[PDB]
Amino acid sequence: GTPVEVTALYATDGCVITSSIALLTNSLLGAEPVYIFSYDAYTHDGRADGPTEQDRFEESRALYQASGGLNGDSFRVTFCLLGTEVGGTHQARGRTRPMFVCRFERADDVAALQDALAHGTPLQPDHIAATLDAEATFALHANMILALTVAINNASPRTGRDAAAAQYDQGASLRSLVGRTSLGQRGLTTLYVHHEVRVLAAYRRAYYGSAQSPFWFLSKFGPDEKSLVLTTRYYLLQAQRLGGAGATYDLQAIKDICATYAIPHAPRPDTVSAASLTSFAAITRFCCTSQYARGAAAAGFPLYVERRIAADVRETSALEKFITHDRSCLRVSDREFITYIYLAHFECFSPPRLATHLRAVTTHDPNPAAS
Amino acid sequence: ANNRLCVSLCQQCFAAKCDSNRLHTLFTIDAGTPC
Amino acid sequence: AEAFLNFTSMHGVQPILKRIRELSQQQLDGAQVPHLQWFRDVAALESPAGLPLREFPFAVYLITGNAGSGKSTCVQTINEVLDCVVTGATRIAAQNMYAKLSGAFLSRPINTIFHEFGFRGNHVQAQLGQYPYTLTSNPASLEDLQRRDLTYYWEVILDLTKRALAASGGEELRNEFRALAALERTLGLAEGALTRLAPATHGALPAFTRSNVIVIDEAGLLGRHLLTAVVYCWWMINALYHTPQYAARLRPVLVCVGSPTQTASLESTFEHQKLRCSVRQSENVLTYLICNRTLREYARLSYSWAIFINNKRCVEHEFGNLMKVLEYGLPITEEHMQFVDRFVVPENYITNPANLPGWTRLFSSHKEVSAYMAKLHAYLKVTREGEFVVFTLPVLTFVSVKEFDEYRRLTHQPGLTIEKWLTANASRITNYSQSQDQDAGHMRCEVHSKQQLVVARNDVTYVLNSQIAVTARLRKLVFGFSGTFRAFEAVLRDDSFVKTQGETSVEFAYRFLSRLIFSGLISFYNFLQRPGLDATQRTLAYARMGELTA
Amino acid sequence: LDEQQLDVFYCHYTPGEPETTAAVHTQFALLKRAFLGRFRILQELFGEAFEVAPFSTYVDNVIFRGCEMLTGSPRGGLMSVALQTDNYTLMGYTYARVFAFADELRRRHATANVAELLEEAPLPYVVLRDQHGFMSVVNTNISEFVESIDSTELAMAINADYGISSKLAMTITRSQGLSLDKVAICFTPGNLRLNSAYVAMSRTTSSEFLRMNLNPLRERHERDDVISEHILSALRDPNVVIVY
DNA sequence: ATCTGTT
Ligand SMILES: Cc1nc(N(C)C(=O)Cc2ccc(-c3ccccn3)cc2)sc1S(N)(=O)=O
């Protein structure tokens, strides 16, 4: 068919920035295995006609066939970390930043990628080094090289030596420096070799907050298995790409909404336990083999998010309009006005009423047609 | 208080500095011992 | 549970976000942006009598509410969605805000508002308000109010302007942003592609060059003359570096969070000759914004106001009704008077140190607190119940003889006594305001020649095994102890202790923990010395520990 | 005490000085494993009686006499900064000398006379214990006072104290940025205002722990309703947002 | 009557 696109959030035990830079520069002296924590798969649209709610559900459920092994032949994967992109304007600000890109076409590469995505084994640096895409990988680290070069050379450029042949133009120094600098592998490798500390410090500021321990993830997105999988995947990856009406909500709201997505259960032979959170191996194996990461359970969360948000807003808006209209045209004293304000607001949003409303919007099936 | 009895002592003074025409409270004690 | 306690507070914050985002994107005209010549003109003045009339644009958004109503979730969502700068009016407020924000998802360090616009140590001892000013305009325009505010705060403003203009390499223009723009123009790239990466490569640039949305928390304790200064400072900085946002013609947006009822600000002054301290009340920022007519018309406060009601903690009826009556200024009836009669008790009951143990006493003076503390310390000795001891420690102050001579010469009045001057200046030499509530003894002073100094020495009394608080930023050194066995195991199991420290001494923390663990062995047999412990289980433990060690 | 009376693991294991990060991590992991194993063995041996056993471990040898602590030298131990929102306990005072504090005082302060005079006559340090139970030594509090008269600035005085406070009594103005659990108020007739009463009566969550010496609603007081009028008039505006 | 900003 067509290359399937994949976005992979990746992590490693150690210093992720140093290992990534060593991988990029080909200085195979600090590379380490990479663990894939979360991912999402999609196919290019190719058709403007917006499919109905029951068409995209089926199309998406056809991807995660029955074992988390995506259906396809050739794959295009983008490995990324935490951080916020700069220079872009939208409704909200981003939460992740791409790091590099690889293409898997051969049989061996496809088998390795499927094994990594199904069970959870780490990927050795050999495959990543061999399958890297140079033209697209280095289109990202293009302006940073120029900025770092200018900052390093920013020692006073007098450009007035004159003499016999040293009388280069005021603007000629920067022009020549730009011309002689290659915005590719060579420039980055030389800068790393000669100015390692400054380069590392500069890179650690564009990817703020990219080095966290497993307990941080467990505390933020856990402690439940269903939450730990679904909420992580939606909040970090799909929310910005899909860009619906739920892209301006914070993490607490998303967890609250997920609490109502009640679907059948099936206990596992065993769970994860403490004293193993010193590495990403146990958490990765636990997450990749879950039953919420494939099938019809993972193909129908975003639709429920949209439906629930719309259902809540529908009633909230009408109640607010009624209250405001009544408030704006009442002629009474202060005591009566305060009494009315608090009485109306209590009558609308008392605890039992909220409990009933919440019990009225609970689903027991991922299929939109059988909700 | 909740199902109890409250007994208080009050005074009214006729001096110019205190007030007069006004009632003042001195202390409050509980009287619920002999239920 | 915890799902229906956030239902109504998470659907009502969207309009606030929409309005703030709309406000923070409007563009100014080309004939309104302050130029860099205005500050050069100001820096070359001697008295505030030569200031002309000028305007500095800005915009505001108010968030007022009762204490305990839940206005923090708004800041949480704003930080998570928008790009802003979060500050605080004091140190406690900043620490609480950082705790919340970092406990939710993620955050950077949080500082005060004084550190943001360049407040130094010396400015703490300036004289505020010496030159007369009289409003001239019938309902004064914005320029009149701005000039009055700049005249009130003259010393700090002038010093900051001089320092900022001189420190920028004299007349050498800063090259942090200009070189990148020149290179981008030469190479023919998209606008803003290379300049916006300046903060990443330079790690000392101020935060006011990064965003134009400023959040001020607990703004009720700030004086009204600080609404202008901040604004002023912003423009100046952005005119010096020529930042990317200065070229797009944007203006600051100030989001002020507070409560206008249970908060006030005070101003004090010192009068020489008689050596007297005078304190009074003034206006704060929220009242300035709400009450003034010109500001109300300029900032359009009707479309930029959100109000939080409700209280989450009250579970009583009459108490809530009384609180509402007191807050909203309703008339007082006899039912409230009858209700409030349950809490009264004689004063001698309260002032006895043997009644109501562990309760806090609120007075209205610095002398009653001292008297009660002395009474309590005297009582804790003779009528001892154990596990409470009282001891004393010395404190001291050094003076300057030459500087005292100079001050006396400048102020005249040759006849002066060190004791009287020190007694008069008791409220200003110290660092914190609780120095007057301490139980201290008789004063004593001496003169040490050779070094030509005068030293005053005194004693202060403290209790043992009592809870205290640190009113300052002091460095501390950890040197042992971890509690009971279970607590020690729990602390060692999790790595949060490592993460709390900065990302520079992880190896140091590991080494310290390793040393403590190494010294933590032995003494197990002292535990085994418990009477009536065992006979053979001791040998079983011996064998087990030997096998484990092998 | 058997042949392994002193945990002969000591006499057969000598954990020498540390090394590069890898060696430090390996040693730390091995020590954690050993400590956890020995603790598990002992807990299985005895249990609850062992769980609450007293414990104390220090980098060096320390002794306590009355209200004083005698120790050799404070070598090692990571430095840190004390926060103003944390709770501590007053353990005592010590006369041990620390090089870091003295060197910092020499560095930051250019006043050599004060430093020398303090060196001739020393001051004690304060020893505290935090919530979790880690003994800490805290530095002294030094402040500088320079006056400004007319347009001249003169440095005049320096103060040296400890800078700790107790939450057992305070004024009413200070408590406007605090929260309490039990309160006992004390008004004074003659200068009573209603706002002071409102601020003082709202420091606690409930009314079961409140006391006072007079009734402020039956006495004479001053009122000023200017902000309340504006707030009430803003609630009838259809353009103001109200959040429950 | 009266508080808090600065490594
Ligand atoms: C049956 C009922 N329960 C009601 N609750 C829970 C409340 O008022 C809750 C509350 C709301 C605001 C405050 C407050 C406190 C200080 C300053 C301003 N405001 C206190 C408490 S209200 C009603 S009723 N009789 O109006 O319908």
Distance C391 CA to E7 C1' (A): 32
| C-alpha of residue C317 to centroid of ligand 1, in Å | 8
Cα distance between residue D7 and residue D3, in whole Å: 9
A180-to-A146, A151, A184, C180 alpha-carbon distances in Å:
11, 16, 12, 17
Beta strands in C466-522 (DSSP E): 467-470, 475-480
How many Cβ atoms are within 10 Å of C344's Cβ, its own excluded? 19
Where on the phi/psi map is residue D154: left (φ > 0), alpha (ψ -120 to 50), or beta?
A: beta
3-state helix, strand, coil in chain C (%, to 5): 45, 15, 40
Is the distance from CB of A237 to CB of A10 less than 8 angstroms?
no
3-state helix, strand, coil in chain D (%, to 5): 30, 25, 45
Instruction: Give me the phi and psi of D160, to 5 degrees please.
Output: -135, 115
Residue C1, burial from CB neighbour count under 10 angstroms (0-12, 13-18, 19+) = exposed
Say whether the peptide bond before residue A122 is cis (omega within 30 degrees of 0). no
Tokens 């900025």 belong to which residue?
A147
Token code pair at residue A139: 């289109």
- The DSSP-derived string for B1-35 is -TT--EEEEEE---STTT-SSS-EEEEEEE--S--
Tokens 């009822």 belong to which residue?
C261
Residue C258, burial from CB neighbour count under 10 angstroms (0-12, 13-18, 19+) = buried
Cα distance between residue D1 and residue D21, in whole Å: 37
Could you tell me which residues come within 8 angstroms of residue D132 by beta carbon, excluding any fewer than 6 positions away?
C482, C483, C487, C491
- The reply to whether residue B27 touches residue C346, judged by beta carbons under 8 angstroms, is yes
- The DSSP-derived string for C344-386 is B--HHHHH-TTSSTT-EEEESSHHHHHHHHHHHHHHHHHT--S
Question: Is the sign of the CA dihedral C114, C120, C125, C127 positive or negative?
Answer: negative
Tokens 């290659």 belong to which residue?
A182
**Count of CB contacts below 8 A, A vs C?**
108
Distance D155 CA to E6 C1' (A): 15
The 3-state DSSP class for residue C214 equals strand
Tell me the pairing of strands D135-138 and D125-129.
antiparallel
Q: Which residues of D touch C308 (CB under 8 A)?
A: 243
Distance D27 CA to E4 C1' (A): 48
Beta strands in C130-219 (DSSP E): 213-217
Is the distance from CB of A102 to CB of A79 less than 8 angstroms?
yes
* Residue C67, marked binder: yes
Tell me the pairing of strands C444-448 and C360-363.
unpaired
CA-closest candidate to residue D216, choices D205, D201, D238: D201
Where on the phi/psi map is residue C452: left (φ > 0), alpha (ψ -120 to 50), or beta?
A: left
CA-closest candidate to residue C434, choices C473, C468, C399: C468
Cα distance between residue A95 and residue A97, in whole Å: 7
Cα distance between residue C157 and residue C207, in whole Å: 20
C contact test, residue of D57, D170, D236 with most C CBs within 10 A: D57
Q: Which residues pair with B8 in a beta bridge?
A: B28
Token code pair at residue A242: 């899909």
Is the distance from CB of A101 to CB of A76 less than 8 angstroms?
yes
Distance C85 CA to E7 C1' (A): 21
Task: HSE, CB side, 13 Å, CA atoms: give it for residue C307.
Answer: 18
**Length of chain A as a residue count:** 371
| C-alpha of residue A340 to centroid of ligand 1, in Å | 12
Cα distance between residue C397 and residue C445, in whole Å: 9
For atom 25 of ligand 1, the residue with the nearest CA is A343
Tokens 């969550």 belong to which residue?
D205
Instruction: Give me the phi and psi of A297, to 5 degrees please.
Output: -70, -40
Report yes or no: D169 at the A interface, CB cutoff 8 Å: no
**Length of chain B as a residue count:** 35
Report yes or no: B21 at the C interface, CB cutoff 8 Å: no
Question: Is the sign of the CA dihedral D219, D221, D227, D232 positive or negative?
Answer: positive
D187-to-B17, C126, D225 alpha-carbon distances in Å:
17, 35, 22
- C142-152 helix and C154-167 helix, angle to the nearest 10 degrees: 90
Could you tell me which residues come within 8 angstroms of residue A50 by beta carbon, excluding any fewer than 6 positions away?
none
The 3-state DSSP class for residue C268 equals strand
C191 lines ligand 1 (CB under 6 A): no
Question: Is the sign of the CA dihedral D102, D104, D109, D112 positive or negative?
Answer: positive
Q: Which nucleotide is nearest to C427 (CA to C1')?
A: E3
Distance A27 CA to E6 C1' (A): 48
For atom 1 of ligand 1, the residue with the nearest CA is A346
- A143-153 helix and C178-187 helix, angle to the nearest 10 degrees: 130
- The reply to whether residue C76 touches residue A201, judged by beta carbons under 8 angstroms, is no
Cα distance between residue A108 and residue A152, in whole Å: 43
Is the distance from CB of D98 to CB of D127 less than 8 angstroms?
no
Cα distance between residue D206 and residue D204, in whole Å: 6
The 3-state DSSP class for residue C204 equals coil
Could you tell me which residues come within 8 angstroms of residue A119 by beta carbon, excluding any fewer than 6 positions away?
A285, A288, A289
Residue C71, burial from CB neighbour count under 10 angstroms (0-12, 13-18, 19+) = buried
Residue A122: DSSP 8-state: P
For atom 17 of ligand 1, the residue with the nearest CA is C324
Could you tell me which residues come within 8 angstroms of residue C55 by beta carbon, excluding any fewer than 6 positions away?
C32, C142, C143, C146
> What is the 3-state secondary structure of A37-106?
EEEEEECCCCCCCCCCHHHHHHHHHCCCCCCCCCCCCCEEEEEEEECCCCCCCCCCCCCEEEEEEEEECC
How many Cβ atoms are within 10 Å of C301's Cβ, its own excluded? 19
Tokens 């579970």 belong to which residue?
C315
A343 lines ligand 1 (CB under 6 A): yes
Q: Which residue of C has its CA nearest to D191?
A: C364
Tell me the pairing of strands D68-71 and D62-65.
antiparallel
A148-to-A145, C189, C192 alpha-carbon distances in Å:
5, 17, 16
CA-closest candidate to residue D197, choices D207, D212, D208, D182: D212
Residue A238: DSSP 8-state: I
C139-to-A54, C145, C149, C296 alpha-carbon distances in Å:
65, 10, 16, 13
Is the distance from CB of D194 to CB of C329 less than 8 angstroms?
no
Q: Give residues preceding each break in chain D, C–N over 2.5 A.
A: none
Token code pair at residue C333: 């009836």
- The reply to whether residue C341 touches residue B25, judged by beta carbons under 8 angstroms, is yes
Q: Which residues of C touch B8 (CB under 8 A)?
A: 341, 344
- A301-328 helix and A334-348 helix, angle to the nearest 10 degrees: 160
The 3-state DSSP class for residue C131 equals coil
Token code pair at residue C30: 């080309």
Nucleotides of strand E within 7 Å of the protein's CB atoms: 1-7
Long-range contacts of C280-283 (CB under 8 A, 24+ apart): C282/C223, C282/C224, C283/C223, C283/C224
Token code pair at residue A103: 């293409």
CA-closest candidate to residue C220, choices D177, D117, D149: D177
How many Cβ atoms are within 10 Å of C325's Cβ, its own excluded? 17
Of ligand 1's listed atoms, the one at least distance from the Cα of C314 is: 21
Is the distance from CB of C201 to CB of A151 less than 8 angstroms?
yes
Cα distance from A178 to chain C (closest Cα, Å)?
A: 9
Cα distance between residue D33 and residue D95, in whole Å: 37
**Length of chain C as a residue count:** 550
The 3-state DSSP class for residue C89 equals coil
Q: Which nucleotide is nearest to C367 (CA to C1')?
A: E1
> Which residue's CA lies closest to nucleotide E7 at its C1' atom?
C473
Cα distance between residue C162 and residue C166, in whole Å: 6
Is the distance from CB of C267 to CB of C223 less than 8 angstroms?
yes
**Length of chain D as a residue count:** 244
- The reply to whether residue C180 touches residue A150, judged by beta carbons under 8 angstroms, is yes
Cα distance between residue C77 and residue C15, in whole Å: 12
* Residue C72, marked binder: yes
Is the distance from CB of D135 to CB of D129 less than 8 angstroms?
yes
CA-closest candidate to residue A267, choices A227, A225, A296, A231: A225
The answer to whether chain A touches chain C by having 3 or more C-beta pairs less than 8 angstroms apart is yes
Stated in angstroms to one decimal place, the resolution of this structure is 3.2
Report yes or no: C330 at the A interface, CB cutoff 8 Å: yes
For atom 12 of ligand 1, the residue with the nearest CA is C310
Token code pair at residue C373: 């503390």
E strand or H helix that includes residue C189: none
Experimental technique used to determine this entry:
cryo-EM
Q: Which nucleotide is nearest to C281 (CA to C1')?
A: E2
Cα distance between residue A3 and residue B11, in whole Å: 93
Residue D137, burial from CB neighbour count under 10 angstroms (0-12, 13-18, 19+) = buried
C68 lines ligand 1 (CB under 6 A): no
Is the distance from CB of A248 to CB of C17 less than 8 angstroms?
yes
Tokens 């509402």 belong to which residue?
C324
Cα distance from B34 to chain D (closest Cα, Å)?
A: 23
